[PDB]
Nucleic acid binder design. Structure first.
Ligand SMILES: [Mg+2]
Ligand SMILES: [Mg+2]
Ligand SMILES: [Mg+2]
Ligand SMILES: [Mg+2]
Ligand SMILES: [Mg+2]
Ligand SMILES: [Mg+2]
Ligand SMILES: [Mg+2]
Ligand SMILES: [Mg+2]
Ligand SMILES: [Mg+2]
Ligand SMILES: [Mg+2]
Lengths: 138, 145, 178, 261
RNA sequence: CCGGCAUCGCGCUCCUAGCCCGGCAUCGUUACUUUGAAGAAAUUAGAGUGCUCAAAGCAAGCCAUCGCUCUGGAUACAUUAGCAUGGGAUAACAUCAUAGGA
RNA sequence: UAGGAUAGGGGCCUACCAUGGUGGUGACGGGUGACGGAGAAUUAGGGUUCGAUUCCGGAGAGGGAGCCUGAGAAACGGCUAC
RNA sequence: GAAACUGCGAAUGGCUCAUUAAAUCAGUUAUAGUUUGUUUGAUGGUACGUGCUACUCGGAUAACCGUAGUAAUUCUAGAGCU
């Protein structure tokens, strides 16, 4: 059972200190490996498109998910970013600047796309939203 | 005498030993008499300091140091230095989240006048003075074995 | 330069102490004066904090010395340094500091003690009732000099002042000079 | 910092100046003088703020360069001069005289006095001791040093000082049974009568005081300033005769005064 | 709710000391609790006030809205540590069998 | 212990002497994408996280180091050297 | 009155948060362990006369005027004044 002594404050406080490391969220935020990730603790990052690849969807689905492999400017890492909309892959060209964000779920893959946790949100300084909705052109 | 054991003759400041017209009742430290003082704050000058032969510049009762500041009470923890002790203060620190306590301690160096005798683990009362060495800022005033 | 801060020191635990600051001018020290005992007197002023002055004496020759039991203070010369309780090499270098032991010409004291018609003798006779002059001083006198201790800080006030040894102190330094 | 500070930012100014927090970035920063600059009231506030004799910084300077304002008997042209407790501010051009006294809320007020009660002040002695050539002199708590005092005046007592002759004319012996006005802490402004003094060897002495309307309180020695001998005080009191009251008492005061209007 | 006593209440010279009389100080310490002092402002809470409301701000309101009147610019919270005050249940630590007791 | 130095206490530094001092009540070391505080966000209560930034305190002026002037600077909208 | 000598100030303010984890810092102390231009109040004999009421007046520098150097700078030399 729990220690209950009046003079037990050290035991309780040190015990909580030790046991908090068993919690995945605490350990994820207090261990430092987020600075080793592609974005290095950033919401967005700019990159240069290296190639367009295209990835299959997992078993219950069947489709080709069209993604662009990007190189991050700040650190030179290489990632794959989904291009969200119908026909927006044709806006992407080779060696153009692109603004990438997370997919949601904070670094964990979304939906049926295997091993992709990044999404393309801007190309050539112009939104994919404005290009898909014809508000602006590049 | 017993005091003069160092490479220079040790004497109290401002007492003229080789006086001409001496006396036994003028005042402490007048006409050659050994100087002593009462520290104040309700402490009593030990007799061994009164009729003592030791010479200690740092003694509260016969030296030049004044006692002012805080008056801590603790237990002696170490008496293996020359005329200096380490005392332990034991206290309870409150841990607010858990609404409980824990035992903490602090080691305070304090100068011990030769007029006292301390074993290990005697109750000591120390009073604050000016820095006497790198770590010492307190002086022993009472020792209860 | 030379500094008086605690930063370079190790903690009482023995742990090393990181530098969180540069050296401040209110923390300075200077190099010592090691006042030599020589004829060509030189005392050189120092501008110190508050706009004030200290007198660094580089070389002194004369001094002011008090003879306590006789209650007289006279200017005299310093002949040598014979014992220093801190470092002997100070003695070998004839360096004046506080609490050094020096020999003193003692003639101005002798001529004061030569003193002490009708009304003059009715006062010499008033004195000599309490003449003691313990033999230890008398022997030194016949030698010509007195052993004396410096009671001032030559590198601080630019002076060499002191007293002649008497009683317990005199005999202690005598047995140490043996 | 590598030296003395010369600006006082407005949020750091004393709270009893009642300076508004958006009225600029700086506050007057009282110059050195006979009061401790945290318990003073500079001339800029006396003229511009309270008396509304001037509307701006420079108007106060235009007033002072003309030698109108007189502080304790001399003309002080310094603009941040630290006037303090029990000083007299006099404008002969308007023939008007003020004694600086506290109100119960702990803020300085200019209490108008007559010309008779403006040639004198009271001053509490910091200490008495000897000086060069054995001459005794006493220290006040506002800088004044007087030589050859009455050999009875001891520390913490009060003295009456005529501004004309600049010497003592009377004194009050600090002791139990005298009226005192508190000059520090939360009780500043409250007058009372010394009922008890308890010594503590090595710490501050504490005083226990009882108001004329019965309310009992306490302070420490340094914050007590005797006014008069016996229950009668020697100087005038402000709008409230130094009597603190609860918030409910003044709520009653406002609503009761709201029926006659 | 509490003061002031009395039962089978270890004392006082010295401070306070009623008209022989309460309510005196050192010859075990703490934690705990009560009250007080001293605690920067800004922020927070909160009293007052019709910036036209509000977020605000520290103002303003009356005069015959005529040679000026009344003014305000409160109050509170502030864990731990340090200072002082009463309590002595609860719990620590020290300790009357060598009577070296009063 | 005695000195020297300092505006002054002090191993601050020198000479001599003793063998100490801190540590599971966490010393010493390491990380900090760490200036501290007043404070901020969310708050049933208890809490969790944040505090580069206008107020207070500290520190620095490319990196170290040394200085003059002066009451006050180890100053950088001063100097000297690397 | 410009210029110039003299004096004063430029050590405050402003910016930033790199270094720094009993350090800074906060509440709380201490200086009987010190410095403090300035403000404010008080205060001040003898300098030589063998203490017998005071005992004599300097040169030299800017602004100016004028001869230059150097590619150059609130870089700089020499001469005439006061
Ligand atoms: Mg989880
Ligand atoms: Mg600054
Ligand atoms: Mg000012
Ligand atoms: Mg020393
Ligand atoms: Mg950092
Ligand atoms: Mg940063
Ligand atoms: Mg700042
Ligand atoms: Mg700096
Ligand atoms: Mg830069
Ligand atoms: Mg520098």
């Amino acid at each position: 059972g729990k220690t209950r002594g009046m003079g037990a404050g050290r035991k309780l406080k040190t015990h909580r200190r030790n046991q908090r490391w068993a919690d995945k969220a605490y350990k994820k935020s207090h261990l430092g490996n987020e600075w080793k990730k592609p974005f290095a603790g950033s919401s967005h990052a700019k990159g240069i498109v290296l190639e367009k690849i295209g990835i299959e969807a997992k078993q219950p689905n069947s489709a080709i998910r069209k993604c662009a492999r990007v190189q991050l400017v700040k650190n030179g890492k290489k990632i794959a970013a989904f291009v969200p909309n119908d026909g927006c892959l044709n806006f992407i060209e080779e060696n153009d600047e692109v603004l990438i964000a997370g997919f949601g779920r904070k670094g964990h893959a979304v939906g049926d796309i295997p091993g992709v946790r990044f999404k393309v949100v801007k190309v050539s300084g112009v939104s994919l939203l404005a290009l898909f909705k014809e508000k602006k052109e590049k | 005498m017993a005091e003069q054991t160092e490479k220079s003759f040790l004497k109290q400041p401002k007492v003229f030993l080789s006086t001409k017209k001496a006396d036994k009742a003028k005042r402490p430290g007048k006409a050659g008499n050994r100087f002593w003082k009462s520290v104040g704050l309700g402490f009593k000058t030990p007799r061994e300091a009164i009729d003592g032969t030791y010479i200690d510049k740092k003694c509260p009762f016969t030296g030049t140091v004044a006692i002012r500041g805080r008056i801590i009470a603790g237990t002696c923890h170490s008496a293996k230095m020359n005329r200096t002790i380490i005392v332990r203060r034991n206290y309870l620190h409150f841990v607010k989240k858990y609404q409980r306590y824990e035992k903490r301690h602090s080691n305070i160096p304090a100068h011990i006048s030769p007029c006292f005798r301390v074993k290990e683990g005697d109750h000591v009362i120390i009073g604050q003075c000016r820095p006497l060495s790198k770590t010492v800022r307190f002086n022993v005033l009472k020792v209860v074995p | 330069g030379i500094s008086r801060d605690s930063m370079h020191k190790r903690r009482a635990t023995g742990g090393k102490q990181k530098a969180w600051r540069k050296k401040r001018k209110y923390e300075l020290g200077r190099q010592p004066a090691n006042t030599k005992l020589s004829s060509n007197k030189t005392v050189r002023r120092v501008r110190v904090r508050g706009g004030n002055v200290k007198w660094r004496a580089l070389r002194l020759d004369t001094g002011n010395f008090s003879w306590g039991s006789e209650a007289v203070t006279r200017k005299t010369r310093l002949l040598d340094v014979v014992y220093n309780s801190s470092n002997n090499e100070l003695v070998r270098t004839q360096t004046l500091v506080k609490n050094a032991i020096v020999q003193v010409d003692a003639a101005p004291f002798k001529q004061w003690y030569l003193t002490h018609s009708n009304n003059v003798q009715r006062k010499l006779e008033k004195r000599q009732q309490g003449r003691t002059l313990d033999s230890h001083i008398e022997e030194q006198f016949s030698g010509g000099r007195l052993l004396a201790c410096i009671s001032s800080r030559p590198g601080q006030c630019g002076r060499a002042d002191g007293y002649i040894l008497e009683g317990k102190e005199l005999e202690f330094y005598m047995r140490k000079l043996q | 910092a590598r030296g003395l500070k010369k600006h006082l930012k407005r949020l750091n100014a004393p709270s009893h100046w009642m300076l508004d927090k958006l009225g600029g970035a700086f506050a007057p920063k009282p110059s050195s003088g006979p009061h401790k600059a945290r318990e003073c009231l500079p001339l800029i506030l006396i003229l511009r703020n309270r008396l509304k004799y001037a509307l701006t910084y420079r108007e106060v300077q235009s007033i002072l360069m003309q030698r109108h304002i007189m502080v304790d008997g001399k003309v002080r042209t310094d603009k941040t001069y630290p006037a303090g407790f029990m000083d007299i501010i006099s404008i002969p051009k308007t023939g008007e005289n003020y004694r600086l006294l506290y109100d119960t809320k702990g803020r300085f007020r200019l209490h108008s006095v007559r010309d008779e009660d403006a040639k004198f002040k009271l001053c509490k002695v910091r200490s008495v001791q000897f000086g060069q050539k054995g001459i005794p002199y006493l220290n006040t708590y506002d800088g004044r040093t007087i030589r050859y005092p009455d050999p009875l005046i001891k520390a913490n007592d009060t003295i009456k000082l005529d501004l004309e002759t600049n010497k003592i004319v009377d004194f009050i012996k600090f002791d139990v049974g005298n009226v005192v006005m508190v000059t520090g802490g939360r009780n500043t402004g409250r007058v009372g009568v010394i009922k008890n003094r308890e010594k503590h060897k090595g710490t501050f002495e504490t005083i226990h005081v009882e108001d004329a309307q019965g309310h009992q309180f306490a302070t420490r020695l340094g914050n007590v300033f005797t006014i008069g001998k016996g229950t009668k005080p020697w100087v005038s009191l402000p709008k409230g005769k130094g009597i603190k009251l609860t918030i409910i008492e003044e709520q009653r005061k406002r609503d009761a005064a709201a029926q006659a209007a």
